[PDB]
Amino acid sequence: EWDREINNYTSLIHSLIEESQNQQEKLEQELLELDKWASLWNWFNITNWLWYIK
Amino acid sequence: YTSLIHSLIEESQNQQEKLEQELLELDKWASLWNWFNITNWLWYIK
User: Fold this and answer.
1) Where do glycans attach (chain A)?
2) Which CATH code fits A1-54?
3) Cα torsion angle, B18, B22, B23, B27, sign
4) SS3 per residue for chain B
5) With an 8 Å Cβ cutoff, is B8 touching chain A?
6) CATH 2.60.40.1510 fits B1-46, yes or no
7) Are the beta carbons of B33 and A6 closer than 8 angstroms?
8) Relative to the CA of A33, which of A49, B34, B41, B43 has its CA 20 to 30 Å away?
């Protein structure tokens, strides 16, 4: 009976919430990795600029 | 950039909030339907 559908729809909503949470987590991890390398390339660029100071 | 990526995680959070509210509404429906089912069963086994 309709309890099957209710249980199925409940599980699907949970699956979607989890997929959305996983997408959020991946974006956060991507931003953290990009921030790390942005910081290292910024460091490299600054270091090159400082060389010219006599 | 700053404003654009800001909106993407916000979009994800908005989606999750909507799905959470859909679950709570579905739970209310489940409660209503279960009440009918139990009343019906008790009537038939009385």
Assistant:
1) 8, 45
2) 1.10.287.210
3) positive
4) CHHHHHHHHHHHHHHHHHHHHHHHHHHHHHHHHHHHHHHHHHHHHC
5) yes
6) no
7) yes
8) A49
